[model samples]
Target: ERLDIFGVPIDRVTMIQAVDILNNFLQENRLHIVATPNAEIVMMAQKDKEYMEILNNTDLNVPDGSGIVFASKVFKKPLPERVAGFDLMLEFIKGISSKGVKIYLLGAAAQVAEQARANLEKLYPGVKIVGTHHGYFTEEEENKIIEEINNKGAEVLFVALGAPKQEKWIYKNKDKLKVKIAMGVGGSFDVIAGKVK
Candidate 1:
């Protein structure tokens, strides 16, 4: 279920619930947009109406910060808990490995993205990583990258271009994508590749 916090609708869910929802989207081959907004993102949305609407329209806006949990409690509409985005990705990747899910990587430097891919492949054996490209591409380059992803038949796309950029890109180009689930994972690639801790 979803609850309003500071004018943004956030899904009140446990880690398990989030996984189940995302799994369903993948199983059904649906275009599901997932966002994890913290207090900063929420406040940013409060000012940017278009961004706010984009966020509001997302299939799932999991509360990804303690501030959300705190604010919800203050308003007497406490969310179940903070559904950390990184944790969700980790668990989802681990849980979905056996299903032969094909994923595409976007964001970070070319080497970093590849390193993240290597780490993920090593960590989660049998995970199918269809293709990858760095976030530093020209508009024309990005168009080609999109086509490449489509050609590779990716089912899940992880855009790590940081906040609004990642979310905005996904929201804008989602209709053209053939993927079942698209998510903004921030610096997770760096973390997974051992560049950040």
Candidate 2:
């Protein structure tokens, strides 16, 4: 069952279950949006009804914070545990090793996403990071950026513009995306490259 957290329907699932869902998404042919919303995102959505609308409709909204777990308890529908965005990405990559995957990292400052790609290469040699682009880009650049993503034939896309910004971007561009699964990974690349604490 789904719980209502400011119209953001939270999926009640653990880390492994979430990864399984991701595997399922990879098998599909259409773009399936995955949102890893924490308490802050739920709060942010309150201020932006359109963002809330996006979160509520996404295929998966895995719990990503302890605050959300506690809030779920308050609602008498406690989550199994926090399924962090960073862990979700790593686990999915780890699980897909022998099978191979084409991932595109589309966020963080210039060079940050590249470092992440380098790290992922060392960590999962079987997987391929098809493409990458910095989070900071003009509206004009975005048109070409989306075109490039599709051009490269990326199957998995990770957008890391943080919270609702990434959510809105993914929602706005889902139709244009040729990827099988598109997820908004907030600062995962930064952490991956050891650029942050």
Candidate 3:
């Protein structure tokens, strides 16, 4: 769990290990929440009080992009690996499917989130996708969606709602969420859906 990162602590984790942990949670049927931090996350945290709190408070904060590695050195916490969330999602979803762990995709445009679900299913056979909704939903809508995901028994929940809102939402509702592993994955759905470069 402990990488070379300093200020970042042992926050970084290998993709395989992350999935293993996720699968373990699914097998045990426990809440196994996690998160990924990139340069965008760091900078957003640096500027926003709420975001900083969420970043520091994440259960599993893996360095999500190269900028995090660079900033880690500047902040005296040089991390190992460039485990971007999109790539990690790609790798882990495969494992999740084989292990029979269900997933819930939340955030991004409705179309993008939908595309992301289809793409993951195509890439990973037998992936048990439970539910999906867009980032534009109202709190009422979110609550309904959350209830749906929980009722469906999703183990891994991916939130691509973008930045602070997503992280804050996870934190605020972590205790209430029935899913085991919930991660606030900003813009990941867009990338996975081929809407971004």
User: TM-score, each model?
Assistant: 0.96, 0.96, 0.86
The candidates, ranked best first by lDDT, are 2, 1, 3
Q: For candidate 1, lDDT tens digit of each residue in 1-197? A: 67787788988888899999899898776788999888889889888888888998898887896887888886555788777899999898998888898899999877888999899889899998888889989989989999988889998899999988899999889888888999999999999989999
C-alpha local distance difference test of each model: 0.88, 0.89, 0.75
Q: Which consecutive 10 residues in model 2 have the weakest lDDT in total? A: 94-103
lDDT of 3 by residue, 40-92 (tens): 66656656877666666666776787776766664444565677777777777
RMSD of every candidate to native, in Å, equals 1.2, 1.2, 2.6
Clashes by residue pair, model 1: none
| TM-score between candidate 1 and the true structure | 0.96
Q: What stretches of model 3 exceed 4 Å from their correct place? A: 1-10, 27-29, 74-77
Q: After superposition, how far is residue 122 of candidate 3 from its true place, in Å?
A: 1.1
Best-performing candidate as measured by lDDT: 2
- Candidate 1, position 69, lDDT: 84
